[model samples]
Target: TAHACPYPMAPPNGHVSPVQAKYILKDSFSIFCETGYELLQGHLPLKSFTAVCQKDGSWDRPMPACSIVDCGPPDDLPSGRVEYITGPGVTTYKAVIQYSCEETFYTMKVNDGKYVCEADGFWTSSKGEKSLPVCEPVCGLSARTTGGQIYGGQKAKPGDFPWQVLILGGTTAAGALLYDNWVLTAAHAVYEQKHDASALDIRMGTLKRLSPHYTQAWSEAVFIHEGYTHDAGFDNDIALIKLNNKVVINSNITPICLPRKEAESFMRTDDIGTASGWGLTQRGFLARNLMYVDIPIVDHQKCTAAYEKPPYPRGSVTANMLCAGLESGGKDSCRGDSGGALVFLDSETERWFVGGIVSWGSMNCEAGQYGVYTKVINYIPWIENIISDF
Candidate 1:
């Protein structure tokens, strides 16, 4: 009678060849690794090599060990690069990778853009996205660079302020390009269409207000600040508009950056800012072409006093608003420019940031009067929350 061999045990990540009713001396069995894995290099010549059972109830070779799967090197990301979080460049099991966009003109779509090699052998994220993360064109990427002037407003070229947007609902207004699918404007400017924003007409990438060459961006929704009150002196008068589709970026369509620091540090009285719109001129009609004015930030105390003694009611210039204009006021943002951006250039970053949103001014946009705007820096938290959450 022949001595019988014991049943074989499977490897850690490997399985035996098949089910067996009996085993005797010289019985042979093969081992196989699951998908995304392979057997360790050893005495076996192949990954599925077999071993024979011995008369002593022991295998002729040790159990073939299955190494954890390796996903290899991470793929190259466009406008970005793969960042190794757990290892320098290793992508083995449980390894993690980070994604960082180029700081020149790109930003990561989200902060949770991390990938980990799961047991199934694929890179995955917290958002359940298996695809490579996206890197968006950052705000404030443009070709125009110049300082403020001494006189009246100047006519703008097509790509001068690519972030400028013309909005047409019940009334004509201006808006800032926040992202490919989002626009920043004054809350009161879109109050009429707040409930039904799909009908709000939007235009961008053009110098002529009535030009057919403008990119027609359709609106899907509008989110106004909850603290906004129509009669509350323009307090908290910011709103965000969501586009049904993303605006394809080009030479004439760009976004302005929101202030990442204190507004006072950048919107200082000694520094100047620019405002562009198709608003009304001293000629008593809406500008046929886009117009831009570069003016300095006004001291809040002087602006508050100027509004206090006006034909206007008390507290027209609230602390939530910033003033930008000349003492002579020949150059300023005007009617039809409501909801536009008052942008400043960050020299260190070489990017233009939106410091304020055109809100209100004299009923007639009279000279010697400063144009008041909703402070943009104060609402950075609100804007980041809205865009990131969605």
Candidate 2:
């Protein structure tokens, strides 16, 4: 009879030692006797062998196994499906995508989050879903109301009109004064007539006292941007006349903020911007008081394209200038709007930034072709350098 035993168990006979061996089955069924097989068939068995064999399928002993491991989590969730393609180092990956609105949803936002990628991997957004990328009205002219009124699609409130300068027709006419010595007028307006300090007078802080009683102090010196040119372009078309005296900052009259740098970020198609000035009304006559209007900023491509074809000719609008207004160009700045400021409100800084100085546009204001303005942001560097030197 055969019995199972533990490893290194005592042999039934003397001078017999247990040995490890491997066996293989053969095709032939013949029984043969070998010298080593004679010792109780060289078989030592034990029930514990069942547990050991079950634990590890090995004649000798079980070996440890290992697998590859993931060290860290993903950097960020994929913007959408499609596994993110990235390298070992940090870098900004970008891809432009085309989008459209659904049939049910007529209003859809496109490229709202589209803009230059910041150092951080994120997106910036613009207000309003979608508006045709076309020129916007430069400024609107309306009655000079004291309390302010909404006209030309914008609100004309107090402190909105920065400076009020009188246009000198043929003579070296004096400029209109606002705060202290500061006088606001069109750079082109001042250039039209020769500079004769004695002939100039600035009137500010007053409503309708031009002829009877002049309440505001007159300007002493005129400092215009050196680049002012009276040609059709209206390049450097705006200027400030420094008063001989300085005025206190108050709610009624205050200085408007200028952009620190050329607002390159604003050139995007979806930029929401506005223009304000005391321009003309629909009848082709200048509006009496301060007026403002909201407008969309069209990308350079579309703007330039629109300005080039049909009623407008190529190179009609210079590259330094930007176009904004309705596609039809019906709403725009008129005669009274020259030198008026086109301010863009910066939600990021919570401050107002000037974008353009109302420049000339197509001759026919009656048509839908809107007015055009010189891009103030383009000259921000020149402005800084000049102001810094001054």
Error of 1 at 107 (Å): 4.0
Candidate 1 residue-wise lDDT, 1-390, digit = tens: 566666777878779886587677767888888765667766333536688877676777777678777777888987678889997977888899988876655678745679988766688887867778777877786666567474667888767888989888665678998777889999988987888886789999999988888899988889999999986678999999998887866668888888987546777885888888766324456777888878888888988888887466886777789887865544344433888888888877877899889888766455457788898888888999898876
List lDDT for all candidates, in order: 0.79, 0.43
**What would the per-residue lDDT of candidate 2 be over residues 1-390, giving only the tens digit for each residue?**
222223332222212122434222211111222212212222321112111222222223222111111112222311111122243322232322222322221223334222221222232124332222111111222223321223245545555544344443343222323323355445665564336544455443333323453334544555566776666556566565655555433333444455665455654454645555444324454444544566556666766666678755467666777666654434443322555555565555554555666666656654345566667766666555533442
Report the poorest 10 consecutive residues by lDDT, candidate 2: 26-35
- Candidate topping TM-score: 1
Residue 288's C-alpha lDDT in candidate 2? Answer: 44
Runs of candidate 2 with Cα error greater than 4 angstroms are 1-151, 162-185, 206-217, 223-228, 280-284, 310-313, 328-336, 366-368, 385-390
Error of 1 at 229 (Å): 1.0
